[PDB]
């Protein structure tokens, strides 16, 4: 039977969406279907943010961030626990996790 009303993608009123390659396995996946996560991480791990600030030649220099947008296909994301299997009724919930 039909498992999801959205067919696992985000294509409505559209014929074709150009594909993207998965970061993990380089599989061609439609842009609307890919599981996308935006991550803004510190470029230096919190253990080294002190000694690198002390080693800085600049007083009060702010470390730049690392901006990245990751694209995954369905097999990579499920395997890497980026998304998880939800119950039949819990699948419908599409608000971001709290």
């Amino acid at each position: 039977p039909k498992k999801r009303a959205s067919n696992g993608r985000n294509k409505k009123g559209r014929g074709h969406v150009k594909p993207v390659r998965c970061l993990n396995c380089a599989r061609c996946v439609p842009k609307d279907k890919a599981i996308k996560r935006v991550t803004i991480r510190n470029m230096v791990e919190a253990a080294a943010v002190r000694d690198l600030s002390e080693a800085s030649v600049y007083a009060e220099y702010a470390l730049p961030k690392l901006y990245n947008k990751l694209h995954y296909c369905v097999s990579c994301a499920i395997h890497a626990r980026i998304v998880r299997v939800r119950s039949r009724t819990d699948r419908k919930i599409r608000t971001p996790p709290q």
């Binding site: 390659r21 970061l23 380089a26 253990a47 080294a48 690198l52 080693a55």
Partner: protein
């Protein structure tokens, strides 16, 4: 004040390059890779190998007169991954803890404005 070089760190998932040049980048001062510190291929990109590689780089810098460096970290880029390898974080901390002074830090990963086909095929690499 300080005498700056440029530490061009290329951290892939198979190796870690610690490469210090001058300001122009046309003159190479020290290039120690994580593969020169281990005899196993599987840990050429290990954080441990990158730390040893950075210390050898820092030691070479001191005897030439380089007292501070700017950091230009990069990943493989191109059609491949844009996140830096595990050795890039260790080589930066090792350089700072070795008495070398740190200047500007920048990510200089080459990023296409949409470009060539990536290896692996349509169905990806099946594992």
């Amino acid at each position: 004040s300080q005498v700056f070089g440029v530490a061009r760190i290329f951290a892939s998932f198979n190796d870690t390059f610690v490469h210090v040049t001058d300001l122009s980048g046309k003159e190479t001062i020290a290039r120690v890779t994580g593969g020169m510190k281990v005899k196993a291929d599987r840990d050429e990109s290990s954080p441990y190998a990158a730390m040893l590689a950075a210390q050898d780089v820092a030691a070479k810098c001191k005897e030439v007169g380089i007292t501070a460096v700017h950091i230009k970290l990069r990943a493989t880029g191109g059609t491949k991954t844009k996140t830096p390898g595990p050795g890039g974080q260790s080589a930066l901390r090792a350089l700072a803890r070795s008495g070398l002074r740190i200047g500007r830090i920048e990510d200089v990963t080459p990023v296409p404005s949409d470009s060539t086909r990536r290896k692996g095929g349509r169905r990806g690499r099946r594992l």
